[PDB]
């Protein structure tokens, strides 16, 4: 769903968000729900839906993330300054009405088309797959 | 036997609802020597009006606590409850009338900073 | 029969309850007749004050030093059972009226 303001910069606080995700999942697994109010358990369900739609990547990151890849450039320019601040090589298929020459490794393409975007997501998926396979 | 209760602001009365006449006993006297007030009589009789059972069920009860109005309200409550115990089917036309709710309008604690519960002193701005 | 009447006083219901149970256990030992903890009402002593000095009488504070109470009518006074009951030591929030 959503981009958080300040993942890559303030990584150690979203780390605590993962820790609370773990705590809440532990509560769910152990099964203590009527130990506290039904309304509060329903609000925990709200918390969990929100936290899961807004966070999946840290659940396996843990590990000083590299500023490699880009999601929806023009509308989340806020995701790039979080990256280039630290300066690591950035890549996205160009959102094609933008400042092209910020990014170390630009790649033209489209901004909207479902088909071209799924294609090139499969391309970079393939790149990662070959890198891991011949590791 | 039949034995049930009603309560309205410190007005407790126990009731024995006999199947007899409409003869009422209130600690050795009747509904006109005790309660010489036709409004209280109406409140007390209205369940009999409701089920159309005036002069079908005698009563023996004890006055205890409260004043006349609280006593009357607790009485008709207890009588309604006895009628539910005699037969439930009159119930859905009673809560319809609210001859069953134990009137939760009790006295308020007299608070401080005042003359009584809510009447403050005359607030001058002097 | 012969009767003995013990009227207990205290401030904490937890203590009056615990002591009543222990005492009735000791009564139960020698087969002496028990009536049990018949609840009397509570006292409510109240002493209103003012919070602050020199003025501000509109501000107040209430307090209430209750005193829970219990009667435990004991019958069949076997004097051996009396010798048993007289000499139990209990929590100090309780005082007793053996009569």
């Amino acid at each position: 769903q959503r981009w958080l303001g300040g993942m890559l910069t303030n990584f150690s606080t979203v780390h605590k968000r993962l820790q609370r995700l773990k705590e809440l999942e532990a509560m769910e697994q152990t099964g203590g729900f009527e130990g506290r109010t039904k309304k509060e358990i329903l609000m925990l369900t709200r918390e969990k839906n929100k936290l899961e739609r807004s966070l999946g990547g840290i659940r396996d990151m843990q590990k000083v993330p590299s500023a490699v890849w880009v999601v929806d450039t023009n509308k989340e320019h806020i995701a790039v300054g979080e990256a280039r601040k630290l300066g690591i090589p950035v890549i996205a298929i160009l959102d094609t009405n933008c400042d092209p020459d910020v990014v170390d490794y630009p790649i033209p393409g489209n901004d909207d088309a479902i088909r071209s975007a799924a294609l090139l997501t499969k391309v970079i998926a393939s790149a990662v797959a070959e890198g891991l396979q011949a590791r | 036997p039949i034995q049930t209760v009603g309560r309205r602001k410190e007005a407790v009365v126990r009731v024995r609802l006999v199947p007899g006449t409409g003869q009422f006993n209130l600690d050795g006297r009747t509904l006109e020597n005790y309660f010489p007030n036709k409004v209280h009589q109406q409140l007390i009789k209205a369940p009999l009006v409701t089920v159309d059972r005036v002069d079908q069920f005698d009563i023996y009860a004890h006055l205890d606590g409260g004043g006349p109005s609280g006593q009357a309200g607790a009485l008709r409550l207890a009588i309604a409850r006895a009628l539910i115990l005699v037969q439930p089917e009159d119930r859905p036309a009673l809560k319809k009338a609210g001859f069953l709710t134990r009137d939760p309008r009790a006295i308020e604690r007299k608070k401080y900073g005042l003359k009584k519960a809510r009447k403050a002193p005359q607030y001058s701005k002097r | 029969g012969q009767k003995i009447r013990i009227r207990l006083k205290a401030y904490d219901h937890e203590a009056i309850d615990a002591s009543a149970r222990k005492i009735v256990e000791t009564v139960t030992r020698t087969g002496a007749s028990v009536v049990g903890p018949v609840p009397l009402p509570t006292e409510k002593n109240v002493y209103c004050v003012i919070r602050s000095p020199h003025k501000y009488k509109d501000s107040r504070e209430h307090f209430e030093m209750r005193t829970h109470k219990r009667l435990i009518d004991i019958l069949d006074p076997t004097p051996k059972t009396v010798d048993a009951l007289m000499r139990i030591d209990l929590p100090a929030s309780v005082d007793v009226n053996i009569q």
Partner: protein
């Protein structure tokens, strides 16, 4: 006057008394006796910190327990101090003195003792940040210390204005009744005038 004693607010519910008995007619007497007791305690020992003073009465005997983390400084190794106090107890009419001294486990988790240590540090010569902050850390490092607050008042370093600023970390839910709390107070010597201290410690919650 904003905030009442948490002890006095939760007294019959969560926390508990500190002088337990029952009495119908000896009541004034027990009260004047007990104030004289606590006064003579403070006057008989001050180098150490009395956390609490608590125990009870019966038909005849008059027992006490008492808390302090340093009883070694207090009691007669051979019996000096305890004997002086049993004599003080004879003088003010105890006559059966079961002075049964005790000590705490975590002096840092004790409100009164932390405040007394802080005020000691202040009356020595010392400034405010390291004393305050180091007491805070000393408490917070311990397991049950789930929250804390400090509210000092007095004329720190920073001439005449009665300034007061607080420090805290954790949780301090003082309108919440299932909470356990510990209050801590002090009012004694200092050059310019008095220094006052208040302390709050939070120690889990209670369900029962």
């Amino acid at each position: 006057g904003q905030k009442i004693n948490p002890h006095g607010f939760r007294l019959g519910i969560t926390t508990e008394w500190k002088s337990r008995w029952y009495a119908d007619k000896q009541y004034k007497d027990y009260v004047k006796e007990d104030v004289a007791i606590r006064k003579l305690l403070a006057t008989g020992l001050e180098r150490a910190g009395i956390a609490d003073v608590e125990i009870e009465r019966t038909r005849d005997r008059v027992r006490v327990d008492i808390h302090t983390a340093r009883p070694g400084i207090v009691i007669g190794r051979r019996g000096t101090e305890a004997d002086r106090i049993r004599a003080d107890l004879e003088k003010l009419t105890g006559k059966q003195v079961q002075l049964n001294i005790l000590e705490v486990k975590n002096p840092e988790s004790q409100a009164q003792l932390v405040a007394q240590g802080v005020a000691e540090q202040l009356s020595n010569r010392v400034a405010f940040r390291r004393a305050m902050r180091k007491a805070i850390q000393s408490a917070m490092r311990q397991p049950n210390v789930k929250g804390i607050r400090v509210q000092c008042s007095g004329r720190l370093g920073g001439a005449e204005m009665s300034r007061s600023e607080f420090y805290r970390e954790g949780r301090v839910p003082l309108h919440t009744l299932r909470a356990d709390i510990d209050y801590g107070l002090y009012e004694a010597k200092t050059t310019f005038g008095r220094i006052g201290v208040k302390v709050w410690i939070y120690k889990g919650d209670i369900v029962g």
